[PDB]
């Protein structure tokens, strides 16, 4: 129960334990009250091809600013959230964090006219240059082609780290990948809920 709250997964960048950060960079600002990411990690999240993963989102050339913003926010969420304990599964990762409907929907809307070449990003890239390239015969086409629904986008872009939830925002039953810093973190209560109910 309490074991699952206010912890950081054991992945390669995460802080051992969450704690306030005097400064986080831009999109990661929302987590600065209590974060699993360092300043350096928050900065690296914003680089053209983040050195955190060396996965290029620009593999089809056309990735729009509004689309990339959602992806940077996703990195901040993964790297900074102290509220993922309940979905930590075995050295750890996260599986099927329930993202609210609006988080998936807007992400999808803002990425429609960007281009990718694959639906299942978890693997099957041409990796020869040190960054991933589209494999042989994988056509660059709009995100709406490879991710027909918001749910496809959320789930497949991050190797099943996230699960698109039928629940909406402020329902207490799903997590937001980003939130306005003024408002305070809506995900604390949600993690508490899953923790208390033995999942
Ligand atoms: C994503 O890709 C980037 C780019 O390759 C990668 O960052 C690079 O990591 C390598 C190794 O981690 C860095 O190389 C080191 O550079 C320092 C100088 O800053 C050297 O002192 C190091 O020398 C020691 O280590 C070598 C083996 O790595 C030994 O052969 C050598 O004898 C020394 O003992 C070493 O060369 C490189 O500087 C960075 N490059 C950049 C631009 O930062 C990043 O790590 C990748 N991300 C992930 C998650 O792997
Ligand atoms: Cl959070």
From Swiss-Prot:
Residues carrying covalently attached carbohydrate according to the record: 54
Main localisation: membrane
Residue numbers spanned by region Important for interaction with IZUMO1: 43-62
Coiled-coil positions: none
SS bond partners: 8-36, 28-76, 37-80, 60-140, 67-111, 100-174, 104-154, 117-134
One MF annotation (Gene Ontology) recorded for this entry: signaling receptor activity
Self-association state and partner proteins as the record states: Monomer. Interacts with IZUMO1; the interaction is direct. IZUMO1 and IZUMO1R/JUNO form a complex with 1:1 stoichiometry. Interacts with FCRL3/MAIA; FCRL3/MAIA replaces IZUMO1R/JUNO as IZUMO1 receptor after sperm-egg adhesion, thereby permitting species-specific gamete fusion. Interacts with WDR54.
Family according to the record: Belongs to the folate receptor family.
Name assigned to this protein: Sperm-egg fusion protein Juno
Gene that encodes the chain: IZUMO1R
Boundaries of the shown chain within the full protein: 20 to 228 of 250
């Amino acid at each position: 129960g309490d074991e699952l709250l206010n912890i950081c997964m054991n992945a390669k960048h995460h802080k051992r334990v969450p704690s306030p950060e005097d400064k986080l960079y831009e999109e990661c600002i929302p987590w600065k009250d209590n974060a699993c990411c360092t300043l350096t990690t928050s900065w690296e999240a914003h680089l053209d091809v983040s050195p955190l993963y060396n996965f290029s989102l620009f593999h089809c050339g056309l990735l729009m600013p509004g689309c990339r913003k959602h992806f940077i926010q996703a990195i901040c969420f993964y790297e900074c959230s102290p509220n993922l304990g309940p979905w930590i599964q075995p050295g750890e990762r996260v599986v099927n964090v329930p993202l609210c409907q609006e988080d998936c929907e807007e992400w999808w809307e803002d990425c429609r006219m960007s281009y990718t070449c694959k639906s299942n990003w978890r693997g099957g890239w041409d990796w020869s240059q040190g960054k991933n390239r589209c494999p042989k015969g994988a056509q660059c086409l709009p995100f709406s082609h490879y991710f027909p629904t918001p749910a496809d986008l959320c789930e497949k872009t991050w190797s099943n780290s996230f699960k698109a939830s039928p629940e909406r925002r402020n329902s207490g039953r799903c997590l937001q990948k980003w939130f306005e810093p003024a408002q305070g973190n809506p995900n604390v209560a949600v993690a508490r809920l899953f923790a208390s109910e033995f999942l």
